[PDB]
Design a protein around this ligand. Structure first.
Ligand SMILES: O=[N+]([O-])c1ccc2nn[nH]c2c1
Length: 305
């Protein structure tokens, strides 16, 4: 048929003892193309690209919109897929009403209410939440977001403690990008800070590495991911994965990094088909514009056998 025979990378990675091979998606994708069909066949977990971000879910203080998030949760449950959520605390997609707050107590209450409301709504149904995203500067210091500037460094401890109470079953992650190389200061810095936060009792269950790679950089993940795992969190994960050129070598190296790290639970790719990627011109995903698996997909299948 037009659809091509294939194997599920999610089925294969589970048979290797990992939890999932996942994909970022949302309602716009699930209703179009072959996205739903490919996700049903080949992936075991879904993450909302945008529908759980702060601008989508709490556009006005205390006025929540769960329509896109509900769609994804409902779709995942109906299709037997795990669900991840996030990002609960992130500077990038933040409504103006939040970034304009200057009172530390107010912003703390706002952040806690945002975390608690989103996590409570889906309590027991979500595998993992990305509680704090992109909290680090490239030099390893903390990024000067409204949360850091107004609340101070304690915002990370408070966010995680609040998330734990909202849904004790969820795995709570901190996530950042440019953690793909051991040579990079951000990688060692997040490890050191996470070690110190865990010594302070912060319930950081996971470090998620947002893995946007250019050609050849897969090999670096083989040293970076073990370094991330040395922070001692229960879990690490590869997330938002895409690879310029989608070389089988790079993708297989990332997969093998996860297989080589006992605490790595799985891998999430940043979409299904190349034309829908934020980097589409670099054809960086595992399915082409015809929704057929690319050589990198086949190479992952062969590596996971
Ligand atoms: O693993 N992901 O691709 C992914 C996509 C969007 C997200 N928002 N929060 N966490 C996310 C993870």
């Amino acid at each position: 048929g037009m659809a091509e025979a294939a194997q599920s990378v999610d089925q294969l990675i589970k048979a290797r003892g990992k939890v999932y091979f996942g994909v970022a998606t949302d309602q716009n994708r699930l209703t179009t193309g072959k996205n739903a069909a490919i996700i049903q066949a080949d992936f075991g977990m879904v993450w909302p690209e945008n529908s759980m971000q702060w601008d989508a879910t709490e556009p006005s203080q205390g006025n929540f919109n769960f329509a896109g998030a509900d769609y994804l949760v409902n779709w995942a449950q109906q299709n037997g897929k795990l669900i991840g959520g996030g990002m609960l605390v992130w500077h990038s997609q933040l409504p103006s009403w939040v970034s304009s707050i200057t009172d530390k107590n107010t912003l703390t209450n706002v952040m806690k209410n945002h975390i608690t409301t989103l996590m409570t709504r889906y309590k027991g149904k979500i595998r993992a939440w990305d509680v704090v995203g992109e909290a680090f500067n490239e030099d390893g210091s903390l990024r000067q977001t409204v949360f850091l500037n107004v609340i101070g460094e304690d915002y990370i401890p408070i966010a995680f403690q609040t998330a734990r109470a909202a849904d004790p079953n969820a795995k709570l992650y901190i996530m950042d990008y440019n953690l793909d190389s051991a040579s990079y200061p951000k990688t060692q810095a997040i490890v050191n800070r996470v070690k110190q936060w865990r010594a302070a009792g912060v319930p950081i269950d996971g470090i998620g590495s947002q893995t946007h790679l250019s050609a050849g950089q897969g090999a670096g993940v083989l040293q970076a991911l073990p370094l991330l795992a040395s922070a001692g969190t229960p879990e690490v994960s590869i997330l938002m994965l895409d690879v310029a050129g989608a070389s089988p070598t790079d993708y297989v190296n990332v997969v093998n990094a996860c297989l080589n790290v006992q605490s790595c639970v799985g891998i999430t790719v940043f979409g299904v088909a190349d034309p829908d990627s934020w980097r589409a011109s670099t054809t960086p995903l595992l399915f082409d514009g015809n929704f057929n698996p690319k050589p990198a997909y086949n190479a992952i299948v062969q590596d996971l056998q």
